[PDB]
Scaffold this active site. Structure first.
Site, PDB file in Angstrom:
ATOM      1  N   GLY A   1      67.459 132.855  64.530  1.00 22.13           N
ATOM      2  CA  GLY A   1      67.071 132.196  65.774  1.00 22.13           C
ATOM      3  C   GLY A   1      68.001 131.060  66.176  1.00 22.13           C
TER       4      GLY A   1
ATOM      5  N   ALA B   1      66.407 126.952  66.712  1.00 22.13           N
ATOM      6  CA  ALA B   1      65.113 126.659  67.308  1.00 22.13           C
ATOM      7  C   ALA B   1      64.230 127.910  67.390  1.00 22.13           C
ATOM      8  CB  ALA B   1      65.321 126.019  68.669  1.00 22.13           C
TER       9      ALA B   1
ATOM     10  N   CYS C   1      68.331 103.349  57.063  1.00 22.20           N
ATOM     11  CA  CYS C   1      68.669 101.934  57.117  1.00 22.20           C
ATOM     12  C   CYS C   1      70.135 101.804  57.515  1.00 22.20           C
ATOM     13  CB  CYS C   1      68.411 101.249  55.777  1.00 22.20           C
ATOM     14  SG  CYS C   1      68.964  99.521  55.708  1.00 22.20           S
TER      15      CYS C   1
ATOM     16  N   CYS D   1      66.124  94.133  51.319  1.00 23.35           N
ATOM     17  CA  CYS D   1      67.198  94.686  52.190  1.00 23.35           C
ATOM     18  C   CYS D   1      66.932  94.301  53.645  1.00 23.35           C
ATOM     19  CB  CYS D   1      67.292  96.196  52.007  1.00 23.35           C
ATOM     20  SG  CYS D   1      68.697  96.944  52.867  1.00 23.35           S
TER      21      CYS D   1
ATOM     22  N   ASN E   1      68.438 137.482  65.882  1.00 25.29           N
ATOM     23  CA  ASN E   1      68.310 136.782  67.158  1.00 25.29           C
ATOM     24  C   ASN E   1      67.839 137.785  68.208  1.00 25.29           C
ATOM     25  OD1 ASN E   1      68.689 133.860  67.854  1.00 25.29           O
ATOM     26  ND2 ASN E   1      69.761 134.681  69.603  1.00 25.29           N
TER      27      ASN E   1
ATOM     28  N   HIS F   1      71.409 117.967  62.974  1.00 24.67           N
ATOM     29  CA  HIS F   1      71.172 117.210  64.196  1.00 24.67           C
ATOM     30  C   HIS F   1      70.097 116.132  64.033  1.00 24.67           C
ATOM     31  CE1 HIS F   1      72.930 120.946  66.484  1.00 24.67           C
ATOM     32  NE2 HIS F   1      73.840 120.275  65.762  1.00 24.67           N
TER      33      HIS F   1
ATOM     34  N   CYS G   1      63.854  98.010  56.518  1.00 27.06           N
ATOM     35  CA  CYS G   1      63.969  98.577  55.183  1.00 27.06           C
ATOM     36  C   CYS G   1      63.133  97.774  54.190  1.00 27.06           C
ATOM     37  CB  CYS G   1      65.427  98.614  54.738  1.00 27.06           C
ATOM     38  SG  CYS G   1      65.679  99.296  53.077  1.00 27.06           S
TER      39      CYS G   1
ATOM     40  N   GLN H   1      68.303 137.287  71.439  1.00 28.36           N
ATOM     41  CA  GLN H   1      69.281 137.241  72.509  1.00 28.36           C
ATOM     42  C   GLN H   1      70.687 137.391  71.949  1.00 28.36           C
ATOM     43  OE1 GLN H   1      68.850 133.354  74.229  1.00 28.36           O
ATOM     44  NE2 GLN H   1      67.666 134.128  75.967  1.00 28.36           N
TER      45      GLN H   1
HETATM   46  N1  LIG Z   1      60.791 134.441  67.266  1.00 29.61           N
HETATM   47  C1  LIG Z   1      62.108 134.571  67.458  1.00 29.61           C
HETATM   48  N2  LIG Z   1      62.779 135.525  66.776  1.00 29.61           N
HETATM   49  C2  LIG Z   1      64.095 135.672  66.969  1.00 29.61           C
HETATM   50  N3  LIG Z   1      64.900 135.001  67.780  1.00 29.61           N
HETATM   51  C3  LIG Z   1      64.212 134.061  68.445  1.00 29.61           C
HETATM   52  C4  LIG Z   1      62.867 133.772  68.344  1.00 29.61           C
HETATM   53  N4  LIG Z   1      62.544 132.724  69.200  1.00 29.61           N
HETATM   54  C5  LIG Z   1      63.674 132.410  69.804  1.00 29.61           C
HETATM   55  N5  LIG Z   1      64.707 133.209  69.393  1.00 29.61           N
HETATM   56  C6  LIG Z   1      66.100 133.105  69.734  1.00 29.61           C
HETATM   57  O1  LIG Z   1      66.511 131.899  69.122  1.00 29.61           O
HETATM   58  C7  LIG Z   1      67.655 131.422  69.848  1.00 29.61           C
HETATM   59  C8  LIG Z   1      67.660 129.937  69.836  1.00 29.61           C
HETATM   60  O2  LIG Z   1      68.846 129.524  70.503  1.00 29.61           O
HETATM   61  P1  LIG Z   1      68.889 128.064  71.108  1.00 29.61           P
HETATM   62  O3  LIG Z   1      67.703 127.790  71.979  1.00 29.61           O
HETATM   63  O4  LIG Z   1      70.274 127.828  71.609  1.00 29.61           O
HETATM   64  O5  LIG Z   1      68.631 127.062  69.870  1.00 29.61           O
HETATM   65  P2  LIG Z   1      69.712 126.460  68.840  1.00 29.61           P
HETATM   66  O6  LIG Z   1      69.039 125.849  67.652  1.00 29.61           O
HETATM   67  O7  LIG Z   1      70.652 127.578  68.638  1.00 29.61           O
HETATM   68  O8  LIG Z   1      70.394 125.301  69.683  1.00 29.61           O
HETATM   69  C9  LIG Z   1      71.303 124.389  69.003  1.00 29.61           C
HETATM   70  C10 LIG Z   1      71.157 122.992  69.545  1.00 29.61           C
HETATM   71  O9  LIG Z   1      71.209 122.996  70.996  1.00 29.61           O
HETATM   72  C11 LIG Z   1      70.520 121.861  71.487  1.00 29.61           C
HETATM   73  O10 LIG Z   1      71.407 121.007  72.138  1.00 29.61           O
HETATM   74  C12 LIG Z   1      69.920 121.170  70.257  1.00 29.61           C
HETATM   75  O11 LIG Z   1      70.727 120.130  69.764  1.00 29.61           O
HETATM   76  C13 LIG Z   1      69.849 122.272  69.213  1.00 29.61           C
HETATM   77  O12 LIG Z   1      69.812 121.792  67.874  1.00 29.61           O
HETATM   78  C14 LIG Z   1      67.546 132.022  71.253  1.00 29.61           C
HETATM   79  O13 LIG Z   1      68.754 132.710  71.469  1.00 29.61           O
HETATM   80  C15 LIG Z   1      66.415 133.048  71.228  1.00 29.61           C
HETATM   81  O14 LIG Z   1      66.845 134.314  71.721  1.00 29.61           O
HETATM   82 ZN   LIG Z   2      68.132  99.143  53.606  1.00 30.58          ZN
END
Ligand SMILES: Nc1ncnc2c1ncn2[C@@H]1O[C@H](COP(=O)(O)OP(=O)(O)OC[C@H]2O[C@H](O)[C@H](O)[C@@H]2O)[C@@H](O)[C@H]1O
Ligand SMILES: [Zn+2]
Ligand SMILES: CCCNC(=O)[C@H](CNC(=O)Cn1cc(C(N)=O)c(=O)[nH]c1=O)NC(=O)CCc1nc(-c2cccnc2)no1
Ligand SMILES: CCCNC(=O)[C@H](CNC(=O)Cn1cc(C(N)=O)c(=O)[nH]c1=O)NC(=O)CCc1nc(-c2cccnc2)no1
Ligand SMILES: CCCNC(=O)[C@H](CNC(=O)Cn1cc(C(N)=O)c(=O)[nH]c1=O)NC(=O)CCc1nc(-c2cccnc2)no1
Ligand SMILES: Nc1ncnc2c1ncn2[C@@H]1O[C@H](COP(=O)(O)OP(=O)(O)OC[C@H]2O[C@H](O)[C@H](O)[C@@H]2O)[C@@H](O)[C@H]1O
Ligand SMILES: Nc1ncnc2c1ncn2[C@@H]1O[C@H](COP(=O)(O)OP(=O)(O)OC[C@H]2O[C@H](O)[C@H](O)[C@@H]2O)[C@@H](O)[C@H]1O
Ligand SMILES: Nc1ncnc2c1ncn2[C@@H]1O[C@H](COP(=O)(O)OP(=O)(O)OC[C@H]2O[C@H](O)[C@H](O)[C@@H]2O)[C@@H](O)[C@H]1O
Ligand SMILES: Nc1ncnc2c1ncn2[C@@H]1O[C@H](COP(=O)(O)OP(=O)(O)OC[C@H]2O[C@H](O)[C@H](O)[C@@H]2O)[C@@H](O)[C@H]1O
Ligand SMILES: Nc1ncnc2c1ncn2[C@@H]1O[C@H](COP(=O)(O)OP(=O)(O)OC[C@H]2O[C@H](O)[C@H](O)[C@@H]2O)[C@@H](O)[C@H]1O
Ligand SMILES: [Zn+2]
Ligand SMILES: [Zn+2]
Ligand SMILES: [Zn+2]
Ligand SMILES: [Zn+2]
Ligand SMILES: [Zn+2]
Lengths: 282, 282, 277, 282, 277, 277
Positions: free
Chosen positions: C193, C39, C127, C156, C219, C119, C152, C221
């Site tokens: 990220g 994300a 469908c 179908c 990342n 995800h 669909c 964090q």
């Molecule tokens: N501009 C940026 N540059 C670098 N790092 C970034 C930036 N913006 C945010 N971050 C980092 O980006 C990291 C995003 O970590 P998370 O928020 O856990 O996202 P996921 O995709 O891993 O979450 C997985 C699933 O969790 C859910 O249940 C859903 O199902 C998701 O699909 C953070 O640590 C920020 O430090």
């Molecule tokens: Zn279909």
């Protein structure tokens, strides 16, 4: 209206054979290279290739009327695309080989091609253009203004005026826009080369402007499938389709014919682009 | 500094439902078509979509400070890309539908988008811009000038002068650049249409310039997710994301939103490009 | 929902620069590069993350709500989204594994046959019967594999359902198979990220390690698997991808608006490689 | 003719080692960023990479003559393509980093590259250019004008005049075109940065114009494989191939080197394009 | 080293023009066209040849040295290099056989799968072990199939060696096989700036003749096999290729700087063919 | 020669607009779309039709002659011709079946492997012996499968003949096979400017119907099979194709002049599809 003299309609077409055709287009190329100021005059024949009928050709509006039949349109005015010819003219202006464009056409296609309005005289009006009777500000619409003959269209002026908007399509008895005429005349007089495309040259004063160029020794070329009023005054007469002539000309001049971006209005000519160097001719 | 009045922070967002949204953007399209001179006013909300927090929104700089929390940046100022909004404005100026742009933003993005500096007033400064205290020559850097509040940056003027370079970011007590203000004012007064984007209109005199347009019968549109100081003065208020509004507007105006070549500085507006003809509205 | 709102880390400039050069080395040296995104690569287009300072979860804990600066429909791909597009185009990206439901990889023009959307995708319905996928121009109205109320149209009339996994759902078998296979055969996995906190997605990168494959994490964090990475780059992904493309001598291409590309096209010409050692 | 002093021919080439080369090109980048008015001086060395021999290099025209041998051409003048250097200069003018270009070259390549003629002084003439002795109107041909030494070419003036066309290639005893010289001088004096490319600076007054810049504290850079007359006056001397230097420079300035559309003549400089913001240098 | 420094021949303009029209005929008529290039196609980019007036060998004999107007790295492809690029793109070139070590065909973007570099490439090293090739951004430091001091990085640590043949070396089996096969099956071979004096390279063109294939030679100087050619064009290759592309109604495409294309892409649209007889 | 010069029908604007939206629906919903064109799609480039008000036959009956506003050589593809080019490029057109002899589909750049030219092409000759086709830059001088006076040049010297069917001739087996197969497997056939009065060509559209396939007719005049169509759009094909591409979110691409493309290239990225029901 009924009385209107419609001139010589339906005259036989003339086709120069290929080799004579190619040699004449070569000479046009030569005149253009040599000329200081080149002025183009267009009429209805430059739009027949986009599905708009002309007036005096074999299937022309007035020709057909004379035989009790109807002209055929293959497009609306809104759906019409500029021809290879129209787009060649855009390019010739851009590279600085065309000084001015004079047109008798109402079909709105030179405007819509993106030809600059300050190098264009629309002598008989434009069907997309309506004009304020108070302030004289013009508006260029995406659709044909529904009236002809300088009538109220029904809309009002929005200038930061509320004047009655009117069409710019001249009826028979109406004199030409003075600004358009004065500028076409000046250009014609001062040109050393005037090239007519798809006009029978039968309407005064429009068809007479290319003769102005013959003053002080200017040259007159006429491109047209049928005879024209001023045939005897021409230094060069090319009898063929205007798109075949203009594409060959562009080929000789080393110019691409530019792509059409769709309907687009340009008020003022941009700065001139580079063009190829000129041949050694003599 | 501590005393500074920061205005109404953190007001509830308003979202027009889809059909009302689409009908209002249609009306904006109508006002633009009708207008002779259109002036845009921008603030911090037009850059939130590039990861730069605003001041007074729900997660704004001043809002967060009020709750004891911190704003979040999703980019550096150097790594920020202009939004769809910023690039729509580039295009509107190029085709001649935007006369002038007034911005309260310091984020440097309109400059970097390639918006022409002679049609832009940066009322509160630019973080990439430093200025000679002697000769007043400005320099537009590829990196943020490391000071704020009209301080010496540490570099000297290179004009063919050696004057002390200083930042252009106003502190609270500093009055606006006179050239920027005088030109924003003139433009605002003479406009017949003023459009605000992503500004709460709470700072004097910046937020008051769109009211100048209401003189002599000019129209005021306000695009903004939250209420604004001059809501009651607006002829049209659009509550939605500025990128959704501007993309729809461009779609209606028949304009592409241009690609961003990366950071690029344009001092003087180029010649206007062709634009589509105007609809028949009434 | 795991550790949320952990402090951000910022590499100083000179370090930052050294590490991107080092990532450029790894790209040049590698035969098969897999990219894994979450994300963090969408936050610079106004879409909040989950576990960053102002993330969905981090904010929900504190009683706050996350903030959107865009709709999903009006969001534009980041410089990162577009760099990955280019990376795949010149044959430098083998496969792309994303956790993101936000539609941006698809709408960027990235080829669907080289992407696993583990995800789901907010714009994609499927469908129940014939399993045919549809990529819509707006978000499919539902979440959690529900009926959207459309049927669909293949040759179908099956019931169309969103593709958006709730907590309890198995991942698309097809996407996960392909993403595992890619992870296993890569000599370089790069995460962008993602905190790497969800199973099984977060762990696919580690599979690269099992073979002598390198692993890079990018990342702001700490992530779950910082201890297993050969290089950790703490900074904004846009900054990192922009410098990296510069080193690679690659332009970041223009977005032509939303566009759907089903199959990778033949590879484009790429810069010659530097001498390394 | 036979008596003509041809200067120091065939001097040993100098090559700066890579790291010194890269550091000097960095400093050139620095001087350019800092300068208000930048003037380029070119000679024959900027065309060797297109297959045209220079005069005083190891295989130069005059060098070879001295050893009783012949220069080698790898192209005709018509078939020669502008170098990476020539095209870098096109771009530098377009983005507003080059004020004026002074060239000793007759090879016609700057013209043909599409460099604007009103920012160019062709001090020794152009082989494609012939000029009317009556009206002074110039014609830029697609082929070399078959004479040298200000002789009648055999063609006549076509100005809307019939004057005798003559070549513009100076013989030894002929003084420079006054308009070209006056404009090169003005530019040189007022510049704060003068950059020489591929010229030994041995001909008066052409090679002396870069010294004019050293007035009022202007800086002089010399790019050249061999020693030059004014080496001791240079603030910076770069010994390497001009294409390697210019490509690196463009890389630092963040400028693409533009594609060559083929032979194309541009009379007047277009409006300046956007360019990248300047680094913080000090 | 053979006959060096022979007099140049220049066809007069009208002849020159007739002969290029005749070459255009042959291209239009032919199903399979092979092009063979040597050092004459690089001389207009500032790289000397071997056996022309000021060639490497011609100058060495006279005690002179050849002259470079460029480095290999800073050399740009000629109009000829770029016309061949276009010729292959629109399906008018079947294969390209070059003697040139100068890297330009590759750096122009010409597809490596339709090119035999019979004598090597200054920018290319190869693994002694796994035979993997690397196209570098600078000249590989060595000549004569020597260790460059770099090691392979495939998935190997093999010893990387230059690809540059000394006098005594066998030609790459792979490149030579492909070039022979192409030469044999072509109905038109065209030579551009090669004296045709080295075996076996110079003789590959003759193999076209054995089948009723035509042979065109384009060269300022006499070549070994002038007697076997159906058309000899004495002029500058740039002039000849430019006129020819004009007749073919083909533009010469812009160079996007150094770029490496491993596989021919699908063919582009071409002008319709003239009526000939 | 059938019913000629029947009155034109013009749908009012609001209807016109509704029906094009409905055609956009059908395109979006369909898996396999076949387009069938005749002389009505060339009339806006100055080439007369046969059976319209001023058609070849309609005029011959009345003693009049048809009128050309162009030569075949100087005719440009319409906005319709170019929209079909784009439609095939983004994978929305499966096959194109044309009655038109005028060369424009080919010269537009449309891929020859997805086009059946059922009645020939004025620019195309074929070898009586080896059946090799040649696409010329001018009209082949003959009509009715006659010797053109040119001979084959493959690797043959066969007699080249025009491809232009007289009234009594069987249709190209190859083109007709492919066009039948396409018609049969399409779930949407769209006719553009054809009266549908010739067998077997006019009837190929009906084969789509036999399977639950939809059929759309777009024509100013009544056609033979108006009774079998699900949608009839009475208007100018340019107007109809322009609005439709706008709805599809497709640009109409520029013509690069006459160009011959033998094989469909890999498909381009397309807009995401709307939600319909
Ligand atoms: N501009 C940026 N540059 C670098 N790092 C970034 C930036 N913006 C945010 N971050 C980092 O980006 C990291 C995003 O970590 P998370 O928020 O856990 O996202 P996921 O995709 O891993 O979450 C997985 C699933 O969790 C859910 O249940 C859903 O199902 C998701 O699909 C953070 O640590 C920020 O430090
Ligand atoms: Zn279909
Ligand atoms: C080039 C000839 C083809 N016809 C045209 O261009 C139209 C007339 N067209 C129609 O009546 C048919 N029509 C069809 C449409 C559609 N195609 O469906 C549509 O949308 N609108 C429409 O009006 N133009 C004109 O009627 C004005 C011609 C004009 N003449 C003068 C003038 C001045 C001085 C002396 N003598 C004459 N000043 O303006
Ligand atoms: C839009 C709001 C977001 N913040 C901003 O744009 C920055 C402040 N930003 C930061 O302190 C954080 N920061 C973060 C960086 C990074 N993102 O890592 C970086 O590189 N530099 C940096 O400074 N701008 C400002 O502080 C100036 C605002 C300003 N106000 C006035 C003014 C005039 C009259 C009356 N009232 C106010 N004149 O200028
Ligand atoms: C850069 C050096 C290479 N040679 C050139 O550029 C040609 C001379 N070239 C040739 O004689 C060979 N030649 C070859 C052709 C082909 N390559 O086949 C072709 O087409 N035409 C042709 O002339 N230029 C010149 O001869 C003029 C040089 C000049 N000097 C002065 C001057 C003024 C004041 C004081 N001192 C000198 N003003 O003009
Ligand atoms: N493709 C073509 N190529 C060459 N010539 C052509 C072509 N198509 C037609 N022509 C010739 O093009 C010529 C067109 O001549 P006219 O039809 O009188 O049009 P105008 O513009 O001069 O009519 C002037 C005014 O008169 C009216 O009342 C209106 O008010 C007009 O504004 C014919 O000779 C054709 O042979
Ligand atoms: N995507 C979006 N779409 C629409 N509106 C938005 C969006 N994002 C935010 N907004 C709205 O955008 C608005 C931004 O209002 P403020 O935050 O006061 O910014 P200013 O530029 O007016 O602040 C003026 C000066 O005050 C400071 O001291 C500085 O000196 C500034 O220069 C909010 O109402 C949001 O709802
Ligand atoms: N690729 C290269 N990179 C750098 N320098 C180069 C290169 N190639 C050559 N040079 C250098 O480029 C320099 C060229 O110096 P000269 O040959 O005197 O040419 P001019 O233009 O100054 O001659 C002036 C007039 O004199 C004549 O009589 C004509 O009238 C001329 O117009 C050499 O020092 C090379 O080392
Ligand atoms: N611009 C030009 N236009 C036409 N011909 C040209 C041009 N420039 C030069 N020539 C001609 O181009 C010809 C080049 O002939 P050679 O110099 O033998 O080069 P090779 O590639 O055939 O040498 C083969 C091997 O020999 C070595 O051992 C290496 O291993 C080489 O790979 C001359 O006849 C010129 O007349
Ligand atoms: N711009 C337009 N928009 C829409 N419809 C149009 C347009 N122009 C013309 N029409 C309509 O387009 C229709 C064209 O109908 P026909 O003339 O029979 O052409 P074919 O291709 O079907 O004739 C088949 C064969 O017949 C011959 O023997 C040849 O062998 C042909 O190959 C008319 O109904 C017009 O109403
Ligand atoms: Zn008014
Ligand atoms: Zn100063
Ligand atoms: Zn004169
Ligand atoms: Zn190896
Ligand atoms: Zn045959």
């Amino acid at each position: 209206p009924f009385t209107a003299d419609k001139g010589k309609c339906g005259l036989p077409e003339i086709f120069d054979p290929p080799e004579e055709l190619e040699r004449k287009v070569w000479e046009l190329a030569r005149l253009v290279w040599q000329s200081s100021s080149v002025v183009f005059h267009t009429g209805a024949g430059i739009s027949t290739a986009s599905g708009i009928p002309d007036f005096r050709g074999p299937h022309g509006v007035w020709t057909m009327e004379e035989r009790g039949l109807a002209p055929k349109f293959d497009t609306t005015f809104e759906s019409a695309r500029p021809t290879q010819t129209h787009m060649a003219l855009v390019q010739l202006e851009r590279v600085g080989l065309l000084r001015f464009l004079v047109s008798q056409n109402v079909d709105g296609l030179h405007v819509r091609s993106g030809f600059p309005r300050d190098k264009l005289a629309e002598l008989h009006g434009n069907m997309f253009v309506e004009e304020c009777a108070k302030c004289k500000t013009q508006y260029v619409r995406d659709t044909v203004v529904g009236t002809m003959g300088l009538k109220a269209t029904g809309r009002l002026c929005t200038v930061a005026c509320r004047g009655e908007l009117r069409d710019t399509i001249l009826d028979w008895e109406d004199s030409l826009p003075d600004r358009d005429l004065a500028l076409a005349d000046e250009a014609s007089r001062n040109a050393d080369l005037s090239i007519t495309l798809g006009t029978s040259l039968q309407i005064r004063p429009s068809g007479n402007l290319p003769l102005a160029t013959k003053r002080r020794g200017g040259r007159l070329v006429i491109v047209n499938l049928q005879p024209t009023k001023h045939d005897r005054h021409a230094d060069l007469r090319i009898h063929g389709y205007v798109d075949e002539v203009m594409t060959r000309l562009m080929k000789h001049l080393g110019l691409e014919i530019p792509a059409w971006d769709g309907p687009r209005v340009l008020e003022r000519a941009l700065p001139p682009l580079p063009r190829p160097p000129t041949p050694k001719l003599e």
